[PDB]
Amino acid sequence: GNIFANLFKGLFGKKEMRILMVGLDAAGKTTILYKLKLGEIVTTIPTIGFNVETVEYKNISFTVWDVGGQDKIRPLWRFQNTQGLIFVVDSNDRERVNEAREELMRMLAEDELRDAVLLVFANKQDLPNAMNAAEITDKLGLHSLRHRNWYIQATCATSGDGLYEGLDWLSNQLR
Ligand SMILES: Nc1nc2c(ncn2[C@@H]2O[C@H](COP(=O)(O)OP(=O)(O)O)[C@@H](O)[C@H]2O)c(=O)[nH]1
Numbered sequence: 674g675n676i677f678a679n680l681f682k683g684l685f686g687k688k689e690m691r692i693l694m695v696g697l698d699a700a701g702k703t704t705i706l707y708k709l710k711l712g713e714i715v716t717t718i719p720t721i722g723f724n725v726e727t728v729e730y731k732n733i734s735f736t737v738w739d740v741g742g743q744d745k746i747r748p749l750w751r752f753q754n755t756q757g758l759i760f761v762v763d764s765n766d767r768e769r770v771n772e773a774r775e776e777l778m779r780m781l782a783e784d785e786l787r788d789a790v791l792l793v794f795a796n797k798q799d800l801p802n803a804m805n806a807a808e809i810t811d812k813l814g815l816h817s818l819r820h821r822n823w824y825i826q827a828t829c830a831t832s833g834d835g836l837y838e839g840l841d842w843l844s845n846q847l848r
């Protein structure tokens with residue numbers, strides 16, 4: 674195809690589009706970048722510990738980096754004109770959603786990512802102990818959020834179910 678490469682057209686034109694993709698460790702943001710098949714993934718290490726991967730089909734830039742971490746996860750992170758915020762959650766991790774909630778809530782508070790559409794990918798939906806979207810949507814309190822227009826597509830990066838269905842949404846929103 675590139676069934677994906679294609680959802681992003683119309684968006685094609687001289688100012689840079691930037692889509693942020695962050696989430697906790699093991700949410701599957703990397704499998705997401707790769708299945709997306711939009712060019713080859715370039716890793717950079719902007720400041721010690723902050724491993725930032727990136728991809729780019731013309732003017733749509735997909736910047737990705739982990740959050741909620743290790744010892745100090747940081748400033749340096751204070752966002753140009755990022756119009757899309759994709760936040761990915763490991764559905765099988767019941768323990769950590771709460772952190773996934775501190776991290777969704779902490780980033781959305783920022784000035785910079787202010788008018789930035791929220792697409793969340795409820796990810797490991799292929800495991801018998803899965804947490805459905807509705808459970809993910811309460812456990813993250815996206816129904817209180819009285820500003821952003823958001824969305825949560827259940828997926829399975831690995832085989833890629835829901836990616837086209839969740840990205841038709843972001844696309845149109847930014848459109
Ligand atoms: N069953 C299943 N495992 C997944 C899924 N997505 C990610 N994984 C696996 O769990 C780990 C996820 O790591 P990765 O995709 O690099 O996540 P990242 O640290 O957020 O970049 C890898 O061993 C993946 O193979 C998924 O949708 N289903």
Ligand SMILES: [Mg+2]
Pocket residue numbers: 702703
């Ligand atoms: Mg990774």
